[PDB]
Design a protein around this ligand. Structure first.
Ligand SMILES: OC[C@H]1O[C@@H](O)[C@H](O)[C@@H](O)[C@@H]1O
Ligand SMILES: OC[C@H]1O[C@@H](O)[C@H](O)[C@@H](O)[C@@H]1O
Lengths: 479, 479
């Protein structure tokens, strides 16, 4: 029964922080940038959904247009990351800075130069960029013109973008991921998931589930083609998938509940099966037939999938879910979840379950036997900044400490292969679900309110010093 | 929502029945046969354990000595199997008929001739033998002389036996399995599991768990060496493992219960991980270190394991288990199970859970992506034979029908790759746990009582006609 206190994480462990371009950069039309799917989502709340508009509508507030102005302020924000001691910085390359409309024959030089400048600023401070190519910010032109990822043509458009980035940043970036949280669209009834993952805005009469699987198929093919392409450009690239890991528990030991939870996880994680094993699960191929989807899946696609399996599994962890049998062995995330009575929840309703992260790490390890990278984890919570500009975020420290304890057990005791750990929203940024600044994740407070007002000044929260010390001690004190 | 009624199992499906040599043959010293570990186990009950004696003790009744005399009666019993329409017959080759003491330099010809005669009788009736090499009947001399599978020397002794069988029956047997229910010894406190799997009779002061893992290691190495050897002798052999598949559910959605059940299944099924993936799970290698086992595991062993992974997973299914968190993340099967309040149980306390078999089939498929073969399934129950020699075993038909429904769903809807299905104890035989005849599994009633008395006549139960019709219709009517 030996303590984990005093034992560090492995040597070479990548501590850092994670963001996405559209949530912090602002500068949404600077440098020739095109309009993205993030730029058409208005401000919402936990109770009122963001509105998805047909382009920019006069008079409406779009939080992603200016965000926190990291497009201009990155030198000073990176200084703060370096003060905390980050080894890496996980962000996205904005697709619309490189291919503003998506279907150009040549990339945008000003966009490429922006990321050279950003990555150089990181590297000058000893911080390695870790890059996600698709992160909920595809060109709105591809949505309007082609129907988004309904259209097979997007595979090549994505690959044109991937190729440019892999070549330009060949000597600057080692770790890449293809499609952020590709499996959010498991909830095929979620307008937000469908737009962010796939550029799908529902058309009357369409079969939502059918089109989700078609789009996901093309994305999986594009990912596999990109893994092969990237390795041709630089064989030392590590190219991963990115899975939203919300584990799903059975409510009870009733056999039907246990089978329903197994199918729920098969449904939410088939994307990982394809990314890692290179083949579709047969239950799901059988579903396509029994639901009469008639998907466009070719022999060439299947060959690409098998040849383009990933090097590691990047994943996010925030929460777990629970299900009971509904009477039909098919999981519909919009309707089939029940609240877990054993755990508490955040103010946005997200269940707090650190033990579930140890479960999840074992689940991925035993299924796939690949290295993992925790590329998002965090607690969205209200902060109050005091008169003397302090932020006493003990609630956020507690959440992160509790999750790190379970991660540390999974690494030291269970022997999970973990590349690194990057908390989400390390500088306060625009929330995805709601567009709120008030749902704060950061170690660094940004003085911007939900209505966009404020000085935009940055202040260190108490969690900044906490995480700085975790990094300095390589997690040794966590117990 | 299409019915499965009217849809058959796949073409080429192997229906049959399963037994083990020591449970039905009798003739325990005929033809030069040596004393086995089955021949030193006395009669018990659900409440009173079988006694394991040091060799044969005068005056005690050993049910396996004469069993049901299939050693002499096989021609007439096989006629009954052929009348039911079996495609295959799953049995073991008695290790002690081939190598009576285990360490001989040459095999026993009379033993080899017995299996030529038995297999020829099957094949003359169009029934293919399916053979398990080790099935709870190893030579007692190896236990006494070497300490059973505590001793590395048993690897070669097992391989001498395997080689002889593979060569002799090269043109008669396609499907082989190495070690029956290799994972029963997960319960390292079970005297029965330790003797039957591993030839281990506890010595005072020994660390039971440590020695279980050592023995299992040598058995896994022997299995992997045998897969390679068999394929050299006949590349068309299909050589499988044999896992006792009791799935383990969490009692509730409490995160600690879910993690404990995950570890319980990792513990009970690491054997499958080794047989299929070719490597130990890291959590378990870490356990060996933290429990200070100092196991004898060499680089050569690990190389053999990786090169000798199996062609298919043979498994038994009878029941499921449930667990709740005990406060320590280590599963001890003798103490850590709780009864599942959602299901009923047999008269020997075995939980009835057909849905769990669909769960299990998905669990193996998604973890390993190998074909499966259900080589045991059945209900041990009291039968009453009427005055007119009928046996109205509707309880047994019901159990088997309910399990076949779930199997059929797993094959037709979930797309699991299933080679065949062989109910256990197809002719009434001596129970393993207790040595009782009264715990009956068969389609064919044998008139022998728990004390060995009776005529030994065979009678068709109602389930015989039921299963004959399942085979004739290739399972099409099951709904
Ligand atoms: O992006 C953060 C989270 O958003 C939720 O809407 C999704 O369902 C999760 O899968 C995801 O991890
Ligand atoms: O042999 C039949 C059954 O015996 C029980 O004692 C074991 O625990 C099971 O794993 C096995 O399937």
């Amino acid at each position: 029964a030996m303590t984990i206190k005093g034992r560090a994480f492995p040597e070479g462990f990548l501590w850092g922080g994670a963001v996405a371009a559209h949530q912090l950069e602002g500068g949404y039309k600077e440098g020739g940038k095109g309009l993205s799917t993030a730029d058409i989502m208005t401000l919402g709340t936990n109770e009122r959904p963001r509105e998805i508009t047909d382009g920019v509508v006069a008079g409406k507030y779009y939080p992603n247009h200016q965000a926190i102005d990291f497009y201009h302020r990155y030198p000073e924000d990176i200084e703060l990351f370096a003060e905390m001691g980050f080894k890496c910085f996980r962000t996205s390359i904005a697709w619309t800075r490189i291919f503003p409309n998506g279907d150009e024959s040549e990339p945008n030089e000003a966009g490429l130069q922006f990321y050279d400048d950003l990555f150089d600023e990181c590297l000058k401070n000893g911080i390695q960029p870790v890059v996600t190519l698709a992160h909920f910010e595809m060109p709105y032109h591809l949505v309007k013109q082609y129907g988004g990822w309904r259209n097979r043509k997007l595979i090549q458009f994505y690959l044109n973008f991937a190729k440019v980035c892999f070549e330009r940043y060949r000597d600057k970036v080692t770790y890449w991921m293809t499609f952020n949280e590709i499996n959010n669209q498991t909830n095929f009834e979620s307008d937000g998931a469908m737009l962010t993952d796939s550029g799908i805005i529902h058309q009357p009469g369409e079969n939502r589930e059918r089109w989700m699987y078609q789009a996901a198929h093309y994305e999986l093919v594009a990912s596999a083609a990109a893994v092969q392409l990237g390795h041709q450009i630089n064989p030392d690239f590590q190219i991963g998938c990115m899975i939203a890991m919300c584990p799903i528990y059975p409510l009870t030991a009733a056999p039907a509940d246990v089978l329903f939870a197994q199918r729920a996880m098969q449904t939410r994680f088939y994307f990982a099966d394809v990314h890692c094993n290179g083949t579709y699960p047969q239950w799901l191929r059988n579903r396509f037939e029994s639901e009469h989807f008639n998907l466009d899946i070719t022999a060439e696609d299947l060959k690409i999938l098998q040849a383009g399996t990933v090097d590691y599994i990047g994943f996010s962890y925030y929460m777990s879910f629970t299900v009971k049998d509904t009477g039909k062995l098919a999981y519909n995330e919009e309707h089939d979840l029940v609240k877990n009575p054993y755990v508490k929840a955040s103010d946005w309703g997200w269940q707090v379950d650190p033990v579930g992260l140890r479960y999840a790490m074992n689940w991925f390890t035993d299924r796939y036997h690949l290295p993992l990278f925790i590329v998002e984890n965090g607690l969205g919570a209200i902060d109050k900044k005091t008169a003397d500009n302090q932020i006493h975020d003990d609630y956020r420290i507690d959440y992160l400490t509790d999750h790190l304890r379970q991660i540390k057990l999974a690494v030291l005791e269970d022997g999970v292969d973990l590349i690194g750990y990057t908390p989400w929203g390390c500088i306060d940024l625009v929330a995805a679900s709601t567009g709120q600044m008030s749902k704060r994740y950061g170690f660094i407070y940004v003085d911007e309110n939900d209505d966009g007002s404020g000085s935009l000044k940055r202040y260190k929260k108490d969690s900044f010093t906490w995480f700085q010390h975790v990094i300095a001690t390589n997690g040794a004190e966590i117990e």
